[PDB]
């Protein structure tokens, strides 16, 4: 996260860290949607152009973290993956369309002060909140700069949703309905963005109707970090809810 700030303790208790077993490295962000399911970006696991194709056994999921590098004794929980599911129509060849993936944990994790699931949006919640100008929140342990450092602790930044036309005019990539962009305009004199290591993380919003936190997006792609005239693109969680239900019902929950 570029231009963010240190998160408070327990501020994003659904935040998950995707961790490479060996070498030991932070792969990506992710989110806890129930006691046994993690939500992330498909590109975190599979990306042929870079020779990226992770498997269940390659990774570890770390939950309830604050500190990026420390092993948080008696606080954090580490889990093993039982199965990975990528959207059947994820488009890695062209534009990262449907950049979404589910991970079923080997065993259910127990909730605590630092570990708690986020809600998935309903049609009406999506309808009400997903509007240009409304702000959402991104979190993660990714880089602080496009070409610096690395944070010590989880970072946080709040960003506004942008109008589809502005989104489209900012890039040469073909934008789908399964995506949305967010960030400040160069004009706005307020910055911030996701960056390397933040991929897969949550873009969340708080309902003013019921006071709950909803995940509306997944950190997907962007051209550089915090560039003027550029925005961040996120996977549109709601548009894909059906696929999520399906998978969860047909295989566990």
């Amino acid at each position: 996260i570029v231009e963010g700030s240190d998160a408070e303790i327990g501020m994003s208790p659904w935040q998950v860290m995707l961790f490479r077993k060996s070498p030991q490295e932070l792969l990506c962000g992710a989110s806890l949607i129930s006691d046994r399911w993690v939500l992330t970006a498909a590109h975190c696991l599979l990306y042929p152009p870079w020779d990226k194709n992770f498997t269940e056994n390659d990774l570890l999921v770390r939950i309830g973290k604050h500190s990026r590098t420390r092993y948080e004794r008696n606080i954090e929980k580490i889990s093993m993956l039982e199965k990975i599911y990528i959207h059947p129509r994820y488009n890695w060849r062209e534009n990262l369309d449907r950049d979404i993936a589910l991970m079923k944990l080997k065993k259910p994790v127990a909730f605590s002060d630092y570990i708690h699931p986020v809600c998935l949006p309903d049609r009406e919640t999506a309808a009400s909140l997903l509007q240009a100008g409304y702000k959402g929140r991104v979190t993660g342990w990714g880089n602080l700069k496009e070409t610096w450092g690395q944070p010590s602790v989880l970072q946080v930044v709040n960003l506004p949703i942008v109008e589809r036309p502005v989104c489209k005019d900012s890039t040469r990539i073909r934008i789908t309905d399964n995506m949305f962009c967010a960030g400040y305009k160069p004009d706005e004199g307020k910055r911030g963005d996701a960056c390397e290591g933040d991929s897969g993380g949550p873009f969340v919003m708080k309902s003013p109707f019921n006071n709950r936190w909803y995940q509306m997006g997944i950190v997907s792609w962007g051209e550089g970090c915090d560039r003027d005239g550029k925005y961040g693109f996120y996977t549109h969680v709601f548009r894909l809810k059906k696929w999520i239900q399906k998978v969860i019902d047909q295989f566990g929950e």
């Binding site: 030991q24 932070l26 590098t69 580490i78």
Partner: peptide
């Protein structure tokens, strides 16, 4: 840069 995690996990 990562601190060693517990072996039970690897």
């Amino acid at each position: 840069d990562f601190e060693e995690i517990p072996e039970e996990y690897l």
